[PDB]
Paper text:
Acetylated lysine (Kac) in the N-terminal tail of H3 or H4 provides a binding scaffold for reader proteins such as those containing a bromodomain or Yaf9, ENL, AF9, Taf14, and Sas5 (YEATS) domain. Human YEATS domains bind to the acetylated N-terminal tail of histone H3; however, their Kac-binding preferences at the level of the nucleosome are unknown.
To investigate the folding and electrostatic potential of YEATS2-YEATS, we determined the crystal structure of the YEATS2-YEATS apo-form at 1.67 Å resolution. YEATS2-YEATS bound much weaker to the unmodified NCP than AF9-YEATS did, but it bound to 147-bp dsDNA slightly stronger than AF9-YEATS did.
Numbering used by the authors: 206 to 296, 299 to 329
Write the structure that this text describes.
């Protein structure tokens, strides 16, 4: 019946020397869809997830993940709203907007950006 869905992102700063010749991206970010802290795995009631990205990611601005974990990894230089559509196995689809937050430690280590928490009724 009642389930918690968390859409979050981590990111790491890419130091200037470690950036690819043809890629001016400052960060590598990962958006994730998980359950509660108590039940992080959502594979048993989530069929797949669609990630709707910023137009700059065209033609790959819509990414489908059907196999857990429900993660998307990309490089970028900007914060934008990531639209996440979660498809449930029994019943139905819900849209979650996650405002991507990029690392400001500038350590080059992966840090938690932000988490968007929603309660779904099913």
């Amino acid at each position: 019946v009642k389930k918690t869905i968390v859409v979050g992102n981590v990111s790491k700063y890419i130091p200037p020397d470690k950036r690819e010749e043809n890629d001016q991206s400052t960060h590598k970010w990962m958006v994730y869809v998980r359950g509660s802290r108590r039940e992080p795995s959502i594979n048993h009631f989530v069929k797949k997830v669609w990630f709707f990205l910023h137009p700059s990611y065209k033609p790959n601005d819509l990414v489908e993940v059907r196999e857990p974990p429900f993660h998307l990894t990309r490089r970028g230089w900007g914060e934008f709203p990531v639209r996440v559509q979660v498809h449930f196995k029994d019943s139905k689809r819900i849209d979650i907007i996650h405002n991507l937050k990029l690392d400001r430690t500038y350590t080059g280590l992966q840090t938690l950006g932000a988490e968007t928490v929603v309660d779904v009724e099913l």
